[PDB]
Scaffold this active site. Structure first.
Site, short mmCIF file in Angstrom:
data_model
loop_
_atom_site.label_atom_id
_atom_site.label_comp_id
_atom_site.label_asym_id
_atom_site.label_seq_id
_atom_site.Cartn_x
_atom_site.Cartn_y
_atom_site.Cartn_z
N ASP B 502 0.84 -1.20 0.00
CA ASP B 502 0.00 0.00 0.00
C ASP B 502 0.88 1.26 0.00
O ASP B 502 2.07 1.19 0.26
CB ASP B 502 -0.86 0.00 1.25
CG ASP B 502 -1.98 0.99 1.20
OD1 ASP B 502 -2.47 1.22 0.09
OD2 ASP B 502 -2.40 1.52 2.27
N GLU B 505 2.16 4.90 -4.31
CA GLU B 505 2.03 5.89 -5.37
C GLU B 505 3.32 6.68 -5.73
O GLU B 505 3.55 6.91 -6.93
CB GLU B 505 0.89 6.87 -5.05
CG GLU B 505 -0.54 6.28 -5.08
CD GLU B 505 -0.83 5.36 -3.90
OE1 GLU B 505 -0.19 5.58 -2.80
OE2 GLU B 505 -1.64 4.38 -4.07
N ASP B 579 -9.73 3.42 -1.59
CA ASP B 579 -10.58 3.85 -0.48
C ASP B 579 -11.91 4.38 -1.03
O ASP B 579 -12.15 5.58 -1.08
CB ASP B 579 -9.85 4.92 0.32
CG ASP B 579 -8.60 4.38 1.02
OD1 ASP B 579 -8.45 3.14 1.14
OD2 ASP B 579 -7.78 5.19 1.47
#
Ligand SMILES: [Ca+2]
Ligand SMILES: [Ca+2]
Lengths: 131, 918
Positions: B502, B505, B579
């Site tokens: 996670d 990015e 999300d």
């Protein structure tokens, strides 16, 4: 006498020749069709000793089933489960969907008889005398 | 906590303004020409120099052009800048950044497909232009025009794709900052607390790409947007900003927006009735794509003069090479499979990872985890994996456990193992900057961290507070990462532990747009601007390689979930849509998102079941389970503020409806795994939209709320509206379709209305198919491994059907050496046969030997012919033996089809067989 049958259903597993389905008695089988891993009674009663009628369950995907009390597989089986006699400890039912799944379900089946087919190699001990 | 709009992105502003100018000037001409005498063609490749005129003096710069014609039938077009290839520029601020245009995107993304076609040949070649013939039987053509430069890509007697037809080609050539066209965005720019030093100045690359005669275009995930992409230059129903790809951590992202999300795949397809084409824009920098629907004429036209409808797209990226592949199809399958040849197919998954995954932020202790595990069993809800979010760590240090709350992680692990279940633990790329933490010591001393514009170590804020970031572009960092995951090193993990990546990015809480500064430096001295959209992928790559082997002699399939991704990430694991929110609109939105993943060559996708943010109602949660069982990746997850919503907490009768959905997923796992196999074989999507399955049906093109499952003929249309009790399904064609559950015949293409109360899943069976399932419920997918199969044979108009079933050990790479079963099933003329899918011949390892006791035991024929009434046996032949099995015939009744069931077939799943009916 057939595997997985509890004392209170023993009387239904009897003839020579034929087996009448316990909860749906208009269907009659050959007694060779008991515990042959085909689900031949629409109440599940021909498979006390295997997992093959475990899809007869209100939680499982509904399929048409002529002779079922509900008309589908979404129905309550006659039998409570697979009976583990557990000599040396105390008898109990386990769910049919725990039968021959490769997991020894010792809490309620301490004799190891749920894994009699040795699915995938599994060998369960008999743990009754210890517990 | 704020995102550039297109006007605040300097190169996006410049390129949109370039278009405004070109589109409204008197015969604008693109100031780009091929110097024809630099041109040469040999062995599938054109090469020349493009001269760009940079002022009214007629001054030029040289931009080398390569056009490759590949054996696949794909073309590639690349344009670099010779001055930068040669280093003949000078950077500002004494930057050590690389001078050349980033050119390693190929090396991260491309894994095959690059063989040149020696059979492509120049067909016509005057002094204004040349035409090359290529592709299969030379039926593809590219016409390259010299002055102004353009390319037209043709087949079947027409242009399908044009480069530079509107003249928007724009390569920003290097230039110094001097004194005396608006130049206020050329140099430093500021946003989100940060100032970009911009040591190279302007360097974007952009191009107009026209899809001639196409009204629908698809792809470029990930966006909360329809499958058929919208226009972006304003007007009723349209967006006003271009689609953006700039992987970012976007808090509470909204519906129906061209704003960027967490991953990007710059691959677009266009489809009309019986014709498909596509392009892949291979560039790892920030990228925007404007889409307008227009006409194949650049002029104003007289009243009544007809033009073809044409989708004009305008693509532009911050830096790097202009590098585009062109796919001419003609089918949807052709395009995706050629794309997969270049960028990779779907990895063979851990088989367990197709099951139900149970997660939230957070399960708070080992005991909480053990309790959830027992409760699933108590409530008869099957599941395969339970997930640990960031609170399992010691103070947000990765490779640790909080030993207060997680005292016995191995014990927890072993409890899961007892039902063949797994554990997934989150590991992110931000490494806490603190002491007594060996991981950060080594990150620093081996120089494995991302750097700033001046070469110092980058530092920023995420979950642990102050942190550094692994630079997974550096092989040395990847090889170090590998070392950290060995079971002996990452204490408390074991053979059933897998990994969630996670925040890759990368997410930097005090960075601009919640990410890194653009002038950060990576390995090779590339700027972050050059490589940004590749960053997540490098990290997932690192983790994938770490899981191949975590002790001596182990060689097995990774499972890694990622948030951020690029083209190629289908080789590394799964993604989810981030999300999302517990609301009906997000439930509906998840299906076009997950579909767009698949048609862009990364099908192993899903969205959080129940929604990440907020608290779903019981009916919303229930319907989300019924949708989520059709996501290739199927996980429940919940934000730290959401109430506990493990599915057994819903209460009756919802608990029962939820369990039925879970069990349906599990029963279909044989078919699901076979769909993943095809995704692996040639990039076939796992769930398939109507444009893919039915390219002859124009009305199918935009539809994105229903789909087929692999190769089964199962057509699903989940309910995604509050309080709905029916559903309208579009029936694609003239075949017979049957309700999965009742076998009712559903009543040529058209809309059928079906009953769909809360307890019901709209799922139909198309005639003409065979699929496999497992009818016995079990507590997890591992406990199914040795159970018998049911084949469902669904007969249509022609009394024929076909399908298949792939099985292997679900874990190893033994499939590479033939250790698998893949059956093709064919029903024709009262006979059902099973043959090896590839037609193979012989040497059996342990797994295959054990599969000798696993059988096909039941066959259901839906739409059984009336002639079968009163026949009570079939004959089975296999491996030179013969026997009889019982069959019961059930006549048509009311709306329900006739169906027959064969019982106790008794044939080993790996064996050829023939079953003769009637
Ligand atoms: Ca039987
Ligand atoms: Ca068991």
């Amino acid at each position: 006498l057939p595997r997985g049958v509890g004392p209170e259903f023993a009387k239904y597993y009897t003839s020579q020749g034929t087996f009448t389905c316990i909860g749906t008695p208009s269907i009659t089988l050959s007694s060779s069709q008991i515990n042959d891993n085909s689900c031949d009674c629409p109440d599940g009663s021909d498979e006390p000793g295997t997992a093959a009628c475990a899809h007869l369950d209100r939680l499982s995907p509904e399929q048409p089933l002529p002779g079922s009390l509900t008309g589908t597989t979404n129905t309550t089986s006659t039998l409570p489960g697979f009976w583990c006699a557990n000599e040396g400890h105390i008898g109990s039912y386990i769910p049919f969907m725990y039968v021959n799944d490769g997991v020894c379900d010792y809490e309620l089946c301490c004799d190891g008889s749920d894994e009699y087919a040795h699915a995938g190699g599994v060998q369960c001990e008999n743990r009754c005398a210890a517990i | 906590h704020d995102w550039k709009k297109c006007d605040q992105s300097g190169f996006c502003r410049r390129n949109r303004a370039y278009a405004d100018h070109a589109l409204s000037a008197i015969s604008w001409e693109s100031p780009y020409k091929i110097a024809p005498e630099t041109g040469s063609f040999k062995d599938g490749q054109y090469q020349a120099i493009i001269l760009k005129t940079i002022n009214d003096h007629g001054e030029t710069v040289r931009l080398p052009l390569t056009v490759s014609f590949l054996e696949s039938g794909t073309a590639r077009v690349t344009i670099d800048e010779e001055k930068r290839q040669k280093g003949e520029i000078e950077l500002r601020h004494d930057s050590k950044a690389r001078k050349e245009r980033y050119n390693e995107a190929e090396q991260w993304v491309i894994v095959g497909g690059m063989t040149l076609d020696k059979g492509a040949k120049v067909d016509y070649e005057d002094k204004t232009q040349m035409t090359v013939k290529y592709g299969p039987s030379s039926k593809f053509e590219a016409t390259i025009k010299f002055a102004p430069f353009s390319i037209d890509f043709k087949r079947d007697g027409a242009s399908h794709i044009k480069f530079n037809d509107q003249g928007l080609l724009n390569i920003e050539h290097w230039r110094p900052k001097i004194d005396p066209e608006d130049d206020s965005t050329w140099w430093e720019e500021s946003f989100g607390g940060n100032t970009d030093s911009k040591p190279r100045g302007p360097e974007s690359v952009g191009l107009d790409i026209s899809f001639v005669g196409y009204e629908h275009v698809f792809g470029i995930p990930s966006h909360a947007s329809p499958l058929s992409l919208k226009q972006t230059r304003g007007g009723e129903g349209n967006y006003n900003e271009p689609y953006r790809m700039y992987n970012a951590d976007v808090f509470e992202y909204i519906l129906d927006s061209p704003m960027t999300l967490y991953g990007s795949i710059p691959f677009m397809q266009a489809h009309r009735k019986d014709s498909s084409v596509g392009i892949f824009w291979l560039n790892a920098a920030e990228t925007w794509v404007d889409i307008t629907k227009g006409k194949d004429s650049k002029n104003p036209l007289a009243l009544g003069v007809k033009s073809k409808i044409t989708t004009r797209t305008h693509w532009f990226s911050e830096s790097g090479l202009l590098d585009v592949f062109v796919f001419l199809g003609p089918t949807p399958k052709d395009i995706i499979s050629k794309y997969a040849e270049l960028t990779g197919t779907t990895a063979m998954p851990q088989e367990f990872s197709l099951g139900y995954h149970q997660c939230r932020w957070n399960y708070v202790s080992d005991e909480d985890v053990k309790d959830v595990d027992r409760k699933m069993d108590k409530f008869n809800m099957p599941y395969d994996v339970i997930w640990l979010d960031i609170e399992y760590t010691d103070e947000k240090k990765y490779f640790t456990w909080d030993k207060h709350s997680f005292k016995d992680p191995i014990g927890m692990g072993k409890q899961l193992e007892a039902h063949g279940r797994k554990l997934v633990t989150i590991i992110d790329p931000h490494i806490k900057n603190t002491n007594n933490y060996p991981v950060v010591d080594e990150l620093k001393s081996k120089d494995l961290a991302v750097k700033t514009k001046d070469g110092s170590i980058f530092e920023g804020w995420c979950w642990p507070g102050s942190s550094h970031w692994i630079d997974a572009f550096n092989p040395a960092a990847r090889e170090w990462w590998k070392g950290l995951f060995k079971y002996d090193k990452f204490k408390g993990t074991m053979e059933n532990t897998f990994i969630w990546n996670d925040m890759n990015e990368p997410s930097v809480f005090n960075g601009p747009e919640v990410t890194m500064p653009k002038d950060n430096l990576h390995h090779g001295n590339w700027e972050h601007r050059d490589v940004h959209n590749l960053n997540g992928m490098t990290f997932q790559n690192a983790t994938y390689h770490a899981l191949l082997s975590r002790k001596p002699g182990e060689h097995r399939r990774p499972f890694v979930l990622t948030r951020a991704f690029f083209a190629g990430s289908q080789r590394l694991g799964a993604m989810w849509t981030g999300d999302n929110t517990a609301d009906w609109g997000y439930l509906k939105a998840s299906i076009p998102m997950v579909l767009s993943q698949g048609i862009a060559g990364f099908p192993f996708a899903g969205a959080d079941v129940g929604g990440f943010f907020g608290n779903p109602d019981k009916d919303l949660l229930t319907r989300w389970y019924q949708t989520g069982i059709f996501y290739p990746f199927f996980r429940a997850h919940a934000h730290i503020d959401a109430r506990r919503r493990e599915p057994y907490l819903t209460g009756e009768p919802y608990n029962t409806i939820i369990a039925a959905a879970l069990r349906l997923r599990y029963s279909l796992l044989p078919s699901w795994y076979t769909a993943f196999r095809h995704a692996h074989l040639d990039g076939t999507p796992i769930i398939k939209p109507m444009f893919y399955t039915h390219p002859s049906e124009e009305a199918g093109l935009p539809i994105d709320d229903q789909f087929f499952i692999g190769n089964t003929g199962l057509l699903a249309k989940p309910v995604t509206d509050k309080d709905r009790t029916s559903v309208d399904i579009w029936i694609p064609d003239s075949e017979v379709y049957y309700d999965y559950f009742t076998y009712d015949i559903i009543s040529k293409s058209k809309t059928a209305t079906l009953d769909a109360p809360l307890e019901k899943i709209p799922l139909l069976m198309r005639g003409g198919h065979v699929f496999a399932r497992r009818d016995i419920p079990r507590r997890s997918s591992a406990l199914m491994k040795w159970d018998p199969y049911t084949l469902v044979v669904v007969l249509g108009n022609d009394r024929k059907a076909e399908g298949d079933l792939y099985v292997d050990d679900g874990d190893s790479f033994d499939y590479e050496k033939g250790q698998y079963i893949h059956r093709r099933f064919i029903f024709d003329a009262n006979t059902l046969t099973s043959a090896d899918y590839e037609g193979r011949d012989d040497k059996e390892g342990e797994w295959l030997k054990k599969m000798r006791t696993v059988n096909v035991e039941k066959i259901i024929v839906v739409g059984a012919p009336a002639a079968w009434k009163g026949k009570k046996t079939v004959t089975v032949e296999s491996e030179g033996k013969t026997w009889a099995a019982a069959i019961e015939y059930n006549p048509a009744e009311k709306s329900r089809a006739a169906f027959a069931v064969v019982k106790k077939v008794g044939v080993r799943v790996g064996a050829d067989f023939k079953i003769v009916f009637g």
